[PDB]
Symmetry: C2
Subunit: 108 residues, 2 copies
C-alpha cells in the first residue's frame, strides 16, 4: 500500500470531477463508475486506473514518485481545463475538499 | 453527491481488500483497478461500481439508504469471508483504518 498525500488525492479527485461534469453536460444525467472510466480514456486518453488508485490508495502503480505522479495528473488537468468553465472548476474544487474532511495546491 | 459515513466507507473498503487479497493468493502478484473489478463480478457477483462509489463518493446509486446500503455490503462480506483467513481479515482491517486517518463496526 503506497502512501499518497491529501494534496495528491485532491488533484486526482479533480480530474475525476472535471471529466465527470464534462460528461454531465454532454449527456443530461450523470456518469457511471465504469462508464465515466471509458469516457476518460477514449475521449481524453486519461488513465482512470492510475487516478483511482491514488484516491482510494487501492492498487499499485509504476511511476510512483512525486514529481512524476504530478506532471502526470497535471497533464490530465491541462487536457480538461479547456473544456470546462469557471463554475465547473469551482464545483469540483468544493466537492474535493468536501471529500477530504484545509486548502490544497492544484498541480500546475 | 450523496453522503456516506466513514463507517460505510470502512466496510466498503474491506470488501475491496478481501477480494483483492483473495486475488493475490490465487495469482502471485497483486490486482489492477479494472482487473480486480471484473474478478469481483464474475467470481463473486460483487458489484464494484456500487462499492467504489461509496468509497470515493463518486457516482450515484439507486438503493441509497442505510439499512440497504448495509445488508448489501454485508452480503458481500459473508460471501468472501469463507475464502479468507484471519490474517487476511486483520490485514484489510488495518489498511482500512490506515486509509481513514477511531474503530468502526463491521457489517454483520
Amino acid at each position: 500500500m503506497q502512501y499518497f498525500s491529501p494534496e495528491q488525492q485532491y488533484n486526482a479527485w479533480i480530474v475525476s470531477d472535471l471529466v465527470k461534469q464534462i460528461f454531465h453536460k454532454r449527456a443530461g444525467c450523470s456518469p457511471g463508475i465504469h462508464e465515466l472510466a471509458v469516457f476518460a480514456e477514449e475521449h481524453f486518453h486519461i488513465d482512470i486506473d492510475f487516478v483511482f488508485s491514488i484516491i482510494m490508495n487501492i492498487g499499485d502503480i509504476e511511476f510512483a514518485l512525486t514529481d512524476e505522479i504530478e506532471k502526470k495528473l497535471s497533464g490530465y488537468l491541462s487536457t480538461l481545463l479547456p473544456y470546462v468553465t469557471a463554475d465547473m472548476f469551482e464545483t469540483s474544487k468544493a466537492n474535493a475538499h468536501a471529500f477530504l474532511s484545509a486548502a490544497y495546491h492544484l498541480f500546475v
